[PDB]
Amino acid sequence: SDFDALGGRVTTVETRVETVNNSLTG
Amino acid sequence: SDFDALGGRVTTVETRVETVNNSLTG
């Protein structure tokens, strides 16, 4: 249906979590 | 359908990651 953008946004937040984690642990 | 609750959980996580980033970087 239209939850394809929802699936994209989940991947976005998945990448963002790792980005924040590695930035702050650095 | 019944994934709008999933659409709310993804948004609350998408703002939770930002609040975690801001709280820890502070």
Swiss-Prot record, chains A, B:
- Phenotypic consequence of gene deletion: Deletion causes substantial alterations in cell envelope structure, and a significant defect in resistance to solvent and shear stresses. Mutants shed exterior layers of the cellular envelope. Deletion mutants show a significant decrease of the UV resistance, especially under desiccation conditions. Deletions mutants show large disruptions in the OM, but the S-layer is unchanged compared to wild-type cells.
Quote the subcellular location field of this record: Cell envelope; Cell outer membrane
Q: How does it assemble?
A: Homotrimer. Part of a heterooligomeric complex resulting in the main assembly named S-layer deinoxanthin-binding complex (SDBC) which is composed of six different subunits, namely SlpA, DR_2310, DR_0505, DR_A0283, DR_A0282, and DR_A0281.
Describe the task this protein carries out: Plays an important role in the structural organization and integrity of the cell envelope, bridging the outer membrane to the peptidoglyan layer. Is a highly abundant molecule in the D.radiodurans cell envelope but is not a fundamental component of the S-layer. Binds the carotenoid deinoxanthin, a strong protective antioxidant specific of this bacterium, and could be part of the first lane of defense against UV radiation, especially under desiccation. Appears to be a nonselective channel.
What additional remark is attached to this entry?
Answer: D.radiodurans possesses an atypical cell envelope comprising an inner membrane, a large periplasmic space with a thick peptidoglycan (PG) layer, and an outer membrane (OM) covered by a surface layer (S-layer).
Q: What is known of its domains?
A: The structure is characterized by a pore region with a massive beta-barrel organization which is embedded in the outer membrane and shows some protrusions into the S-layer, a stalk region consisting of a trimeric coiled coil, and a collar region at the base of the stalk.
Q: What is the protein's given name?
A: Outer membrane protein SlpA
State the encoding gene. slpA
